[PDB]
Symmetry: C2
Subunit: 562 residues, 2 copies
């Protein structure tokens, strides 16, 4: 006997739901603050494990037609009952907390796992500490850990969340004592503990002692003593004694967030093992090393990169071989700065090929990139919401462009094509016409350095500088490159200084990597650093470059023979 | 949206778990001392009786030990396990009590399932039993399928033991119908006579009604004194009744006596260019061309067979896959001689292209025809069971042949190829080497007339004829068919009117195709002009068309409207 479903799995379930709704065969009724729920017993067993032990134990409640169940919400119990009768939960985004609470109370494992997944997928920006305290209240390892890391990453950039103040000690100890604080400085966590304590002083006096010992000598060499002399309760002597002990021991160690080296993330590199096609690696300007990264899909290629001002990496679009015995997928991913993995996000609505993602005003803007090709209005765009986690359609492009580039300058969208340029106003959602270039060049990219756009390359060494306040295109100079070669130019910001990363290739000659330092008033690319081939190998042709901060300890060095 | 499959099956298995492992099982069914702990919700979701029993207000709304009587243990068990998992184990024996308990408990799903199974299971040796069963329980669709299949099979066997134990209304509906298949009107007469003489005074009152449905051509002749012999003694209310009642009931001829020997064609050239091919038929007696229903889903590249019981079947073939596009399917079908439609049957195991369907000893033999496997046994020859409705493999052909034909002579299968021949012994399931032909010819057909095989034509084709004798085991020449020179005759060997005739369509240079059949004199070795097919009735058919010998009804079929 297996489980074949000859149009019967749904028939029986439909009949069960009909019976629940008709007040039929009601052998048990739930009283929830005056509201009656005349359901049956067999089904409540399958769902609630509390009702499983309720409709079987030899206690008098099993022989009680009317049971008065309290500490449960009416709407949550109703949705749980209808899920038990139809399998459809249709959960919203607001009532997830009370639903999970009632599921943990009733011990309904399936809806518990469903809500756990829905919560672990929806830790976006704000409910992080709230759902972290929630998972601390209701033991939930999966939620606890994802939420822990999420806070270690974003909490160390706001450290002012209203919900962060109301936290239990053990959770705060686990948060602060961990070595995953994404902070480039050691005083921010100090003042964050300090603010918390100035808020609930006296009440959590032992807790404040522990949080001072948790900050350790690392951040104990500050005004912590004077602030305490200011707010301590009178007639306290041993407290000063125990505070004087907390300033030198507790294994003084450094932290991890300080290792935010501005590095050079690359994608689609020349793979070492012939079994793989491309790879994503990184380069260190100061450390002069070449680190690697894990492929987000591990088989799909032709992706686009973007870096938010908060140093976040995203990947959208791309094409993957069909593996029949290259199909385009609109999937989306995000790079973890510590786990060295890729957590997917809400996919796009159109399968794009090499999308150009631009970040502005906290929103991700994907401009062009072979949306579907057969659009009525072929020139359209689509943006992303980093807070609401959804895609919003905006005003479509004014001219259809291929192999285009797009940057962001002064909180405005700027997309560049062969010769035209349009500025998209995020406040009014419209395109305004901008200056036209006198040269028609494609297959090139642009960089947003300061208040000037530097469109480099095209087919070459065309250096066409554009300014927003002036609205004009001008030439500066030609990059010094060896003749009889085809340079692959890459313009990007580094250390608040405009530089370039170019590679020259000749006939019967090897490729050479070298970055130059360009000056604004000099119009010359001074030799900054020549990338030695002993550490970096060939990259290819379809590789991309972008600036971002990474961690050396989480990532791994790329092994390659000099 | 739909229903979450994950929970749907999780709930189903959890419900089944609560059933087998006695847990929340509340109501228990007491049947012949066997315990059946189960729930009320599952029983209500399927059985209408159980739904009515619990939701009511009677003592059963608060009872636990219901003594369900007039049921079976295994049937209730399989019904409960189906209600708990959706799995119905339908064998070939317990479907009767299954339908009984389903009609008792009023469970629509299992009722429809077993009704479909019995609509598939309807055959000869259970036609009358299934009809009596569909008369006992109201199963009008099953009742009609029974009646029809019944009708025909009843008027082909009329030896069923269950036929004696039948209700009067059912017998009246069977006999008085205009769908009986009998070459004469006297067999139904003696069938009614024996059904009446099965008893005596229990059939006397029905005697006055059964004679009211049979024509008066036999209600004035014999089998009136035979009833007077079996008449109750001194009964003077039946003798004179039948004496002065043999006057109305205007004698009208039935439909079963309209089976004429016809030339059934398939894959003929479609008249309207919207369709690829069609199926027509020639009337050697009516001299017209009646249309036939299209092959099932325009099934092309198939084979035909006409059993000695005059039944048409279709096996193999290919359907255009959803410009050249064709996929081969192993579907099997059966032609309804009255409803003018192709009823589906049990498909084969392997797909075939142009299979040679041959009937022998009640089995349908499809010998070769482009086997899919193409492995070391590139034949996959299969036999079909007309009793069990299933296929069974037989001894494979020793040699792989292509574009071959097969006939049946002396209860044996004779498959013919370019030059070789092998005879299959069904009793021993073996192949024996036969005589060798001296001419290499293919793409021809053979007709089995008596105890001789007549391989006509071969390669277009020609007028070469090689006659083979089974008792002599030798291939000899007889003559060549006199045809017009510089032409390509399309020969078709067939048996009709107890004589070997040929359907040979010839085409001249810059001329249209001409249809004419000849009668081959067996003792004189000469093809005589039996009849010339005028082109005013029969149009072009094509090249890949087949022909077979069979009987059809002109009444149920309609004339094909087409210009000469």
């Amino acid at each position: 006997e297996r489980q074949i479903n000859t149009e019967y799995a749904v028939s029986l379930l439909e009949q069960l739901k009909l019976f629940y709704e008709q007040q039929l065969f009601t052998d048990i009724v739930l009283i929830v603050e005056g509201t009656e729920f005349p359901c049956h017993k067999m089904v409540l067993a399958t769902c609630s494990s509390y009702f499983r032990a309720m409709f079987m134990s030899g206690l008098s409640e099993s022989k009680q037609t009317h049971v008065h169940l309290r500490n449960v919400d009416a709407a949550t119990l109703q949705i749980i009952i209808t899920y038990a009768y139809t399998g459809n939960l249709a959960m919203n985004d607001s009532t997830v907390e009370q639903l999970y609470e009632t599921a943990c109370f009733l011990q309904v494992e399936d809806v518990l796992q469903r809500c756990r997944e829905y919560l672990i997928k929806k830790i976006n920006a704000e409910n992080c500490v709230r759902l972290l305290s929630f998972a601390d209240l209701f033991s939930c390892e999966e939620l606890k850990q994802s939420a822990k890391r999420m806070v270690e990453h974003k909490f160390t950039a706001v450290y002012h969340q209203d919900a962060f103040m109301q936290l239990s000690h053990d959770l705060l100890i686990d948060i602060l004592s961990s070595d995953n604080l994404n902070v480039e400085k050691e005083e921010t966590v100090r003042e964050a503990a300090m603010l918390w304590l100035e808020y609930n002083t006296e009440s959590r006096s032992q807790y404040l002692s522990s949080v001072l010992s948790q900050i350790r000598i690392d951040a104990l060499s500050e005004v912590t003593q004077r602030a305490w002399f200011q707010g301590l309760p009178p007639n306290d002597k041993s407290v000063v004694v125990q505070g004087l002990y907390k300033s030198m021991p507790k294994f003084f160690k450094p932290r991890l967030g300080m290792t935010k080296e501005e590095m050079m993330i690359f994608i689609e590199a020349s793979s070492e093992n012939p079994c793989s096609l491309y790879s994503s690696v990184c380069y260190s300007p100061q450390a002069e090393k070449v680190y690697k990264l894990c492929s987000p899909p591990a088989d799909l290629h032709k992706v686009g990169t973007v870096v938010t001002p908060d140093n976040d990496i995203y990947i959208a679009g791309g094409q993957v071989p069909l593996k029949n015995t290259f199909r385009t997928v609109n999937c989306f991913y995000w790079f973890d700065a510590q786990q060295n993995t890729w957590f997917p996000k809400t996919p796009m609505l159109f399968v794009r090929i090499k999308p150009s993602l631009v970040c502005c005003e906290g929103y991700i803007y994907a401009i062009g990139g072979d949306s579907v090709g057969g659009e009525l209005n072929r020139r359209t765009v689509e943006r992303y919401d980093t807070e609401k986690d959804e895609w919003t359609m905006v005003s479509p492009l004014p001219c259809a462009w291929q192999w285009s580039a797009a940057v962001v300058v002064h909180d405005c969208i700027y997309v560049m094509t062969l010769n035209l340029m349009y500025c998209y106003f995020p406040r009014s959602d419209s395109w305004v016409e901008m200056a036209m270039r006198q040269t028609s060049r494609s297959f090139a990219s642009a960089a947003a350095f300061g208040d000037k756009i530097f469109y480099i390359g095209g087919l070459s060494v065309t250096v066409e500088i554009y300014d927003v306040n002036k609205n004009e295109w001008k030439m500066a100079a030609n990059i010094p490159a060896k003749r009889y070669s085809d340079p692959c130019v890459r313009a990007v910001v580094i250390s608040n200084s405009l530089c370039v990363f170019m590679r020259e290739t000749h006939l019967n000659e090897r490729a050479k990597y070298v970055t130059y330092q360009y000056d604004l008033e000099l119009d010359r690319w001074s030799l900054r650093q020549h990338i030695s081939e002993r550490v970096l190998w060939d990259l290819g042709r379809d590789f991309r470059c972008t600036v971002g901060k990474l961690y050396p300890s989480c990532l791994e060095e790329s092994p390659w023979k000099p």
